[PDB]
DNA sequence: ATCAATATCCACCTGCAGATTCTACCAAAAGTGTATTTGGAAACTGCTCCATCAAAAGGCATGTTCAGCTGGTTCAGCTGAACATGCCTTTTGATGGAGCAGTTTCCAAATACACTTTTGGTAGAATCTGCAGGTGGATATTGAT
């Protein structure tokens, strides 16, 4: 396989240390670094199966090694690493209670937001007890689908089955529940440098940029892209200027502040949208320019390799070609869901029943 | 050697090709109503193709089942020839019912409107059924004679 890569690595350090070159020089340099390690991630760490499909899956921000993980029956899990102290679990109704939506709370880590296929978009926490329903249905056969949250703004949202997206404070204090889209919204985000500029995703084969202060008119929005299929996701950068999106058929688009419109690169993967497999999320990388997706063959995709196998890839974000491949057999599931530590050391997989950590090995000899 | 079957010829004769004449129904023309097609919202049903257990499909050992073959025994249908008998047929005397054609009276659908049951929508509990025991035939496996 490819991976090549060269520099004069250390001399750039010292260039840093002199003022001549500039720090994204740096950054280039490091991240090249950073792939190079990550080459050493092939040996995976650990596996963790349970009961019912995975669908949603979140980091905990402050610790490494900590993550929640969401199932198909509304089985919540709670997993952290060289603890070993049994994990800790949580039931639910097991048939049509899907949880579908998990971020953390940014202010109490041992609470949790939650949307599910039940109709309730809660804040609970790991040891069983609801602390506060945010929203409802009050009528079955119309769920939620998508939920995001911000600390800065203090905000919540999530999204419908139908094309209506409700917006919360962390109070309550409900002013929103217009309708956005036609279908259901299969992801969303707030802007982590931004407050008050938002992004929706649906099944419309459209996505939407809005201005949650400035706009109240139904549909009096900012800008709206187009695709070609539907979208399974638009996630923001951390840095906030690169917004990624991933559809359902073949496609990832990367769009910039820079004219939000038009798209600055295409990058052809193949992730095609199946019923009973769990949707896929392209991710960034919380402190590099790069993409991580997971693979899934299509034989009738255009692939530039002769070998496609089933496979975690990882591409450059500002050129549009990819950069790495982790493999392993014993896992020859397919990886719907794949999220990089925001610590930047470790890496977490959601495969259909089974939790993946790919992180570094060393310890050779122990004194 | 056969010995009716088919090939050949020839009288004949009656269905059959062909010509004539009456007739009911097919085509054209202007009009209309009414089935159908089309544009377009929307809803709902099948294609979907992993990730996974768990009954179901495959495959290999042993054992039994029976089937296409043998040969023999039994015996029952084929057919000659002779002779009876009702079929043919034909032939015509007898008749009544088929079909037509005129007369009478039934008796069905056209239409408007106002109920009236029928079909879902939707919950509650009654019956079927998984599961678990548990009786008792029962059905094969040895057992006394």
Same mark, same amino acid.
């Given at each position: 396989?490819?991976?090549?890569?060269?520099?004069?690595?250390?001399?750039?350090?010292?260039?840093?240390?002199?003022?001549?070159?500039?720090?994204?020089?740096?950054? =280039?340099?490091? =991240?090249?670094?950073?792939?190079?390690? /990550?080459?050493?991630?092939?040996?995976?760490?650990?596996?963790?199966?349970?009961?019912?499909?995975?669908?949603?899956?979140?980091?905990?921000?402050?610790?490494?090694?900590?993550?929640?993980?969401?199932?198909?029956?509304?089985?919540?899990?709670?997993?952290?690493?060289?603890?070993?102290?049994?994990?800790?679990?949580? *039931?639910?109704?097991?048939?049509?209670?899907?949880?579908?939506?998990?971020?953390?709370?940014?202010?109490?880590?041992?609470?949790?937001?939650?949307?599910?296929?039940?109709?309730?978009?809660?804040?609970?926490?790991?040891?069983?007890?609801?602390?506060?329903?945010?929203?409802?249905?009050?009528?079955?056969?119309?769920?939620?689908?998508?939920?995001?949250?911000?600390?800065?703004?203090?905000?919540?949202?999530?999204?419908?089955?139908?094309?209506?997206?409700?917006?919360?404070?962390?109070?309550?204090?409900? /002013?929103?529940?217009?309708?956005?889209? *036609?279908?259901?919204?299969?992801?969303?985000?707030?802007?982590?440098?931004?407050?008050?500029?938002?992004?929706?995703?649906?099944?419309?084969?459209?996505?939407?940029?809005?201005?949650?202060?400035?706009?109240?008119?139904?549909?009096?929005?900012?800008?709206?892209?187009?695709?070609?299929?539907?979208?399974?996701?638009?996630?923001?950068?951390?840095?906030?200027?690169?917004? /990624?999106?991933?559809?359902? *058929?073949?496609?990832?688009?990367?769009?910039?502040?820079?004219?939000?419109?038009?798209?600055?690169?295409?990058?052809?993967?193949?992730?095609?949208?199946?019923?009973?497999?769990?949707?896929?999320?392209?991710?960034?990388?919380?402190?590099?320019? /790069?993409?991580?997706?997971?693979?899934?063959?299509?034989?009738?995709? *255009?692939?530039?390799?002769?070998?496609?196998?089933?496979?975690?890839?990882?591409?450059?974000?500002?050129?549009?070609?990819?950069?790495?491949?982790?493999?392993?057999?014993?896992?020859?599931?397919?990886?719907?869901?794949?999220?990089?530590?925001?610590?930047?050391?470790?890496?977490?997989?959601?495969?259909?029943?089974?939790?993946?950590?790919?992180?570094?090995?060393?310890?050779?000899?122990?004194?």
């Amino acid at each position: 396989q490819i991976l090549p890569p060269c520099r004069s690595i250390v001399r750039t350090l010292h260039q840093h240390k002199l003022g001549r070159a500039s720090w994204p020089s740096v950054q =280039q340099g490091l =991240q090249q670094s950073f792939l190079h390690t /990550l080459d050493s991630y092939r040996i995976l760490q650990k596996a963790a199966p349970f009961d019912r499909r995975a669908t949603s899956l979140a980091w905990h921000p402050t610790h490494p090694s900590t993550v929640a993980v969401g199932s198909k029956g509304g089985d919540i899990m709670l997993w952290n690493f060289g603890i070993k102290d049994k994990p800790t679990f949580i *039931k639910g109704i097991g048939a049509g209670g899907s949880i579908t939506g998990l971020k953390f709370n940014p202010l109490n880590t041992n609470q949790f937001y939650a949307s599910s296929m039940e109709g309730t978009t809660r804040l609970q926490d790991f040891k069983g007890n609801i602390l506060r329903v945010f929203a409802s249905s009050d009528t079955i056969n119309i769920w939620f689908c998508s939920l995001d949250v911000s600390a800065s703004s203090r905000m919540v949202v999530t999204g419908d089955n139908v094309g209506n997206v409700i917006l919360l404070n962390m109070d309550g204090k409900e /002013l929103w529940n217009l309708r956005m889209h *036609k279908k259901k919204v299969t992801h969303v985000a707030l802007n982590p440098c931004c407050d008050w500029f938002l992004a929706t995703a649906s099944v419309d084969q459209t996505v939407k940029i809005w201005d949650l202060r400035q706009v109240r008119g139904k549909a009096s929005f900012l800008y709206s892209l187009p695709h070609r299929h539907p979208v399974n996701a638009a996630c923001f950068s951390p840095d906030g200027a690169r917004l /990624l999106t991933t559809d359902q *058929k073949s496609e990832i688009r990367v769009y910039s502040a820079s004219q939000w419109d038009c798209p600055l690169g295409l990058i052809p993967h193949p992730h095609r949208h199946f019923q009973h497999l769990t949707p896929i999320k392209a991710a960034w990388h919380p402190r590099y320019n /790069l993409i991580v997706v997971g693979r899934y063959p299509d034989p009738n995709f *255009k692939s530039c390799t002769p070998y496609e196998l089933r496979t975690i890839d990882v591409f450059d974000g500002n050129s549009g070609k990819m950069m790495c491949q982790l493999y392993d057999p014993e896992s020859s599931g397919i990886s719907s869901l794949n999220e990089f530590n925001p610590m930047g050391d470790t890496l977490a997989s959601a495969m259909g029943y089974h939790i993946l950590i790919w992180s570094q090995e060393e310890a050779r000899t122990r004194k």
